[PDB]
Amino acid sequence: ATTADFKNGLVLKNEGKLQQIIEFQHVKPGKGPAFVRTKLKDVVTGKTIDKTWNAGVKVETATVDRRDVTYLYNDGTSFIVMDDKTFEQYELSPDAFGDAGRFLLENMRVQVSFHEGEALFGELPVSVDLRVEHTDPGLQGDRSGGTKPATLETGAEIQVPLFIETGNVLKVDTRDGSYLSRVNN
Ligand code: NA
Numbered sequence: 001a002t003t004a005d006f007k008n009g010l011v012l013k014n015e016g017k018l019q020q021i022i023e024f025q026h027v028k029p030g031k032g033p034a035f036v037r038t039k040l041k042d043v044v045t046g047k048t049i050d051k052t053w054n055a056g057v058k059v060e061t062a063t064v065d066r067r068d069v070t071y072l073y074n075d076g077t078s079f080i081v082m083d084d085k086t087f088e089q090y091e092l093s094p095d096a097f098g099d100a101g102r103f104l105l106e107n108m109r110v111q112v113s114f115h116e117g118e119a120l121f122g123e124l125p126v127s128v129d130l131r132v133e134h135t136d137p138g139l140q141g142d143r144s145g146g147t148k149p150a151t152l153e154t155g156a157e158i159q160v161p162l163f164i165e166t167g168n169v170l171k172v173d174t175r176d177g178s179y180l181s182r183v184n185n
Pocket of ligand 1: 074101102104
């Protein structure tokens with residue numbers, strides 16, 4: 001409706017794009033009119049910009065419908081994906097999950113967001129369990145502290161503590177590709 005309606009995660013229809021408010025601030029400069037600064041992220045492209053607004057100016061929002069979805073596979077071109085409730089099978093851009101698509105497994109439960117029935121983007125869980133394809137031998141005398149590169153079953157690489165071995169199943173933070181913990185048998 002207006003700038004007063006601004007909060008983080010709110011998505012605007014603006015100059016032909018759909019842009020999420022990542023950060024906003026109402027500003028009273030103490031000389032002249034108030035205005036708003038918004039850090040905006042194109043939800044599709046991921047490109048972020050800084051924009052300013054005349055305080056109280058009309059804005060137009062998009063309702064984003066979030067659907068619980070299962071990732072099936074990569075057909076060489078698209079991510080193939082099934083809507084959990086409807087069981088409908090459709091294509092997503094390989095980019096639709098950002099850098100975190102790095103960590104998609106077959107049959108991973110994900111969320112996809114829509115405006116007027118068109119997929120905008122997908123999200124993995126914050127934590128996912130991925131197996132180690134390869135890392136250097138485990139060192140239990142912590143003897144090499146620090147971390148070593150590990151290659152996950154997806155081909156994604158992360159830093160892991162020295163005690164990790166090939167075949168270990170790790171918990172991984174998808175927000176920044178960081179080691180969380182080792183899953184036990
Ligand atoms: Na992939």
